[PDB]
Design a protein around this ligand. Structure first.
Ligand SMILES: Cc1ncc(COP(=O)(O)O)c(C=O)c1O
Ligand SMILES: Cc1ncc(COP(=O)(O)O)c(C=O)c1O
Ligand code: NA
Ligand code: NA
Ligand code: NA
Ligand code: NA
Lengths: 385, 385
């Protein structure tokens, strides 16, 4: 009774988790296909992550950015080496990472002109709730009560090359894009659209920023979605799965975008040894030989079953996604919220999203048998919906 | 070589900490009077905090705000009961907590008028680096490269009743104040100024927001500084020490300010069981019988010694503070940065701040003998500065 009423929740209190399962106070087991909203990349209570956390906790958890710490240095090196090789800034959340990206873009633009501060983002995009990220978020409903927001932002239709082109100008300092939109209902960008974004940013001297907070850290079958697409951004933001459950966020920039100087930006908790230790553990597991290959295989298996379901069930209008980031859209007469609720009642946890969809976001360590259970449960719900 | 160059650091890599001491890779011991910048309230590797973290890590660290979790519920109850009894929203950092406060203020204002969106904050205040909090931050140097920022903010001089009065209007939805400014060099508000702020907010129907991210969680000798002053805000933000090192932030509102509704605001990591477990541990330790009384006694002891130093050393221009949040200002010909560096070379860690000051921010568990060592080290540095 002491929490603000800001969330729409499923009626369950969870106290323990192991792998793909989470349990309530009475021991009832739920198959967790939410991953805490694409966060628990290694599932719950993964032995290596738990051990790393316990080990670091008895050593040092926070020293501040007045000094250096080893986990922070190691994670920065791993992120640079496993991406397009740039510099790293550690934040604590997805919205903070995007705020850093916005600031990097703004300073970059002012290197050329005081008028070069415009930022373009997509309609229905989601980049965060803090005011900078909220302005980038192309969704009026989430902005209205809090206006006026940050000036200089304009929106274009996702995957619409023509619309993005018409809104470009020399005064644009950055273009923000989620390689695969998440909150809007899992909408993959087309390779062509991303390629055009890359070309337009080069033409107008703007920074291409990829927000991989939800689609990053192995969920697509590669470490980052941009690697699947073959389009390299100037700036890349990551969070959620980066820490496998421990709050952490990061921004990676190439040399062109490496414009921040001492005092330009900072954070008290960002880069602390406990969170970075978690990140190092996660990256080492994700990059382990054969791991991402298994993710791709499991993703193909799950997608195959859901696509069959799309043809077989008239209430299922569409299935979209990549790797283990999949969205299922229902016909308008069927409520995605009702479907999610019925799934919950049958011990399957899914995440509602826009466009009347539910998201299947299982941990990357999910078992084939668990994929079978989830699909079976959804089918039974739909057979009575 | 992989981290962005955003910080001015002391040349040391720390890997272990215990109590008021932190150690480098070779085992050299440093007396940590930074508390990781007012974060490590219980010192490093406190047995109870370490045990709580290890215990929770093997159970559940993140489930998302789609569900309820026990540590989150327990911490919300403790924060409400130990303050002015309101509702709680969990963020992950100080800047995120203030962003939530800004959003709460904005929605409150629109309940009365679409023009009621102005927010007042103090010159030299510091509320965070994300764009909303950065606009609240009354420091142009930190804003310039990133403009335009959020519209509707205006600044007044801290502790200047007349200036605050002249900037008030019916279009103001909130007044932001740090009961004791930190980054600017530890500047306590006068009780009279805070009382006038409270009256002006009631007169113009605005929310009084106290940012206790740095002065909160026991550092002043009471749980929160507002309790020392006897002036109650509508909204209170907290972070840093709340988690004793684990990233966490919170916003507490009374009924008047409880205006957020489902979907208005949220966060992926906010309120996770691991961070809230840490917060519960911290609050239980801080509220333990006699704990805060000891903090007040140690604060009085340290302040006494530093005030004597002010009279004795001509290079020391002023000493300000409350509890264990103390700032030492040097004459202009003496560099606060040089003093901090020399302290570091002599194994004492302090935090530089504005107004040519250094901050003494020892853990609340600091020993009297450690206070003696710190003062002795500073005196020796000044005897040769
Ligand atoms: C693409 C994207 N960016 C940013 C965010 C916000 O991340 P956070 O909640 O940690 O601030 C989300 C959350 O869903 C997201 O999907
Ligand atoms: C009063 C105050 N508010 C907010 C902040 C920022 O907190 P964070 O770095 O966790 O975003 C600080 C940091 O020094 C602060 O002193
Ligand atoms: Na169908
Ligand atoms: Na059909
Ligand atoms: Na003096
Ligand atoms: Na003097």
């Amino acid at each position: 009774m002491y929490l603000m009423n800001t969330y729409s929740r499923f009626p369950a209190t969870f106290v323990y988790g192991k792998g793909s399962w989470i349990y309530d106070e009475k021991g009832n087991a739920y198959l967790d296909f939410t991953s805490g909203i694409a966060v628990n990349v290694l599932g719950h209570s993964h032995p290596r992550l738990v051990e790393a956390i316990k080990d670091q906790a008895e050593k040092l958890i926070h020293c501040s950015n007045l000094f250096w710490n080893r986990p922070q240095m190691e994670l920065a090196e791993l992120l640079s080496k496993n991406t397009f090789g740039g510099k790293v800034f550690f934040a604590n959340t997805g919205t903070e990472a995007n705020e850093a990206a916005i600031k990097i873009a703004r300073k970059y633009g002012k290197k050329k002109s005081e008028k070069k501060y415009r930022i373009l983002s997509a309609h229905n995009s989601f980049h965060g709730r803090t005011l900078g990220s909220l302005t980038a978020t192309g969704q009026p409903k989430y902005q209205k009560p809090f206006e006026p927001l940050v000036p200089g932002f304009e929106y274009f239709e996702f995957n619409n090359v023509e619309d993005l082109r018409r809104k470009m100008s020399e005064d644009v300092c950055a273009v923000f894009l989620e390689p695969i939109q998440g909150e809007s209902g899992i909408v993959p960008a087309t390779k062509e659209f991303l390629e055009e974004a890359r070309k337009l940013c080069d033409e107008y001297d703007a920074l291409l920023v990829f927000d991989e907070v939800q689609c990053g850290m192995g969920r697509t079958g590669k470490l980052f979605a941009y690697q699947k697409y073959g389009v390299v951004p100037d700036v890349l933001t990551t969070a959620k799965g980066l820490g496998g459950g421990v709050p952490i966020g990061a921004v990676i920039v190439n040399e062109r975008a490496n414009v921040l100087e001492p005092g330009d930006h900072g954070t008290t908790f960002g880069g602390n040894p406990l969170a970075c230790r978690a990140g190092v553990t996660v990256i080492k597991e994700l990059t382990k030989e054969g791991f991402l290959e298994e993710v791709e295989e499991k993703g193909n298996y799950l997608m195959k079953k859901l696509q069959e379901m799309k043809e077989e069930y008239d209430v299922v209008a569409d299935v979209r996604g990549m790797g283990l980031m999949i969205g299922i859209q229902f016909r308008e007469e069927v409520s995605n919220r009702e479907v999610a609720t019925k799934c919950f009642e049958n011990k399957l946890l899914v995440v509602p999203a826009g466009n009347n969809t539910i998201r299947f976001l299982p941990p990357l360590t999910v078992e084939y048998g668990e994929i079978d259970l989830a699909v079976e449960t959804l089918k039974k719900v739909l057979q009575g919906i």
